[PDB]
A paper describes a structure:
During DNA replication, nucleosome disassembly and reassembly occurs at the replication fork, and histone chaperons CAF-1 and [name] are principally responsible for the deposition of histones H3 and H4 onto replicated DNA. [name] binds a heterodimeric histone H3-H4 complex through its conserved N-terminal domain (aa 1–155) and impedes the formation of the (H3-H4)2 tetramer both inside the nucleus and in the cytoplasm. In vitro studies showed that an N-terminal of human [name] (aa 63–154) binds histone H3 directly through a conserved motif. The principal functions of histone chaperones are to keep the histones in their pre-depositional, DNA-free state.
The N-terminal domain of human [name] (aa 63–154), the globular domain of [name] (aa 1–157) and full-length human histones H3 and H4 were expressed in E. coli. We then crystallized and solved a 3.5-Å structure of the quaternary complex, and the structure was solved by molecular replacement. The H3-H4 heterodimer is centrally located in the quaternary complex, enclosed on one side by [name] and the opposite side by [name]. [name] is composed of an N-terminal tail followed by a short helix (α1), which is connected to a C-terminal helix (α2) via a long loop. The extensive interaction between [name] and H3-H4 buries a total surface area of 1918 Å2. The long loop snakes through the convex surface of the H3-H4 dimer, accounting for ~2/3 of the interaction surface area with H3-H4. Interesting differences occur at the C-terminal end of [name] where 11 residues (aa 154–164) are disordered in our structure. This segment of [name] would bump into α2 of [name] if it took the conformation of that in the ternary [name]-H3-H4 complex. Finally, although scarce, direct interactions between [name] and [name] are observed in the quaternary complex: the guanidine group of Arg118 of [name] forms a hydrogen bond with the hydroxyl group of Asn152 of [name]; and weaker interactions between Gln104 and Asn152 of [name] and Arg118 and Glu111 of [name], respectively. Therefore, [name] appears to have a chaperoning function outside the context of a helicase complex, which functions exclusively in the nucleus.
Numbering used by the authors:
A (entry chain L): 68 to 123
B (entry chain J): 51 to 134
C (entry chain I): 2 to 154
D (entry chain K): 26 to 101
Write the structure that this text describes.
């Protein structure tokens, strides 16, 4: 047998913790500026460079 | 008719997940920022991926007439999806 | 995705364990194909090692006209001698994989339930699995269809 | 990989439909998600470099997720 996953304490796992429940500002983008999406050429240039490692 | 009450769901906590992303991303490229929607997309990916993995583990158990799931049922779930 | 599998149908199911695998595959092609499509049928003998996977058949298809194509794939049953006893009776997987230029773009996996069709044998299964009394039941309506983004040149 | 917790693993399993878990599930789930995250991030970050950016977009991830392979239960 293993660990029971349902019963008295099911609600203990689903308690709201507003201090962890939201993303931190640090590490993220500074502003809401428009940012370029990869061109199809850079998309390919990327995927070829990634296939490089796969080989070793 | 039955009306549903609406509520956000909780799989993995957000702040810990963001710190986890930062950790890993640091090793690939230092001084690198994430858009909130990008981290969220990464989280949505992980969470649905692991939930699906467990769905396989659930189906493996019910037909095999078991109650407890094992790391081997996860290994199978991983295999049917392609990774070695 | 230049080639897209529209459907797979499981033909003799459930069946005796030793019965050959019968699938009906419908795929779609946006344009004519320069290289061949390679379809593999693989039985995962054990989740513990890739060593125990048995390639039951491999078919090469080409050249491919554009449009909806339909064919019937039939591979022989896996060798019971190579299947670790622990995994033999109970749930395992069969994979149908297709590669283009040796690159897998689609994997269709099925969970496979091996079980004795007699009550007495279910109450007390033998220490060594008896494959001739085993039913193979492919959980057909629950496939694991995984698509990978590969180079099409 | 302390980011993901034992409570988290349970939450994921419950939505998965699971009723009981072995002790070894926690250690295992962690190893699996470690690989999965390392892979998707690695690719998304390369995408960002190739676009000459230091701000990662949702599309960087969207593109990296197509690369890892997505599964659906049935055909279309």
């Amino acid at each position: 047998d293993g660990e029971e996953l349902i019963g008295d304490g099911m609600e203990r796992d689903y308690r709201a913790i507003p201090e962890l429940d939201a993303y931190e500002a640090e590490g993220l983008a500074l502003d809401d500026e428009d940012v370029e999406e990869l061109t199809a050429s850079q998309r390919e240039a990327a995927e070829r460079a990634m296939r490089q490692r796969d080989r070793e | 008719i039955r009306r549903y009450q609406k509520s956000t769901e909780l799989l993995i906590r957000k702040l810990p997940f963001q710190r986890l992303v930062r950790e890993i991303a640091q090793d690939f490229k230092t001084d690198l920022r994430f858009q909130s929607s990008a981290v969220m997309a990464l989280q949505e990916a992980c969470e649905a991926y692991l939930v699906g993995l467990f769905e396989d583990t659930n189906l493996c158990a019910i037909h095999a007439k078991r109650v407890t799931i094992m790391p081997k049922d996860i290994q199978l779930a991983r295999r049917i999806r392609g990774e070695r | 995705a230049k080639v897209q599998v529209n459907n797979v149908v499981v033909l003799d199911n459930p069946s005796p364990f030793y019965n050959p695998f019968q699938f009906e595959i419908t795929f779609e092609c946006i344009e004519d194909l320069s290289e061949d499509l390679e379809w593999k049928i693989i039985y995962v003998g054990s989740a513990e090692s890739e060593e125990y996977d048995q390639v039951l058949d491999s078919v090469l298809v080409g050249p491919v006209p554009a449009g909806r194509h339909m064919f019937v794939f039939q591979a022989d049953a896996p060798n019971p001698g190579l299947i670790p006893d622990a995994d033999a009776v109970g749930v395992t997987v069969v994979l149908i994989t297709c590669t283009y230029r040796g690159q897998e773009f689609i994997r269709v996996g099925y969970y496979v339930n091996n079980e004795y069709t007699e009550t007495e044998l279910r109450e007390n299964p033998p220490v060594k699995p008896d494959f001739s009394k085993l039913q193979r039941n492919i959980l057909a309506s629950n496939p694991r269809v995984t698509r990978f983004h590969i180079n099409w040149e | 990989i302390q980011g993901i917790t034992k409570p988290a693993i349970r939450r994921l399993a419950r939505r998965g439909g699971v009723k009981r878990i072995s002790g070894l599930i926690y250690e295992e789930t962690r190893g699996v998600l470690k690989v999965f995250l390392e892979n998707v991030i690695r690719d998304a970050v390369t995408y960002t470099e190739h676009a000459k950016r230091k701000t990662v977009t949702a599309m960087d991830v969207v593109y990296a997720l197509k690369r890892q392979g997505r599964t659906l239960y049935g055909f279309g």
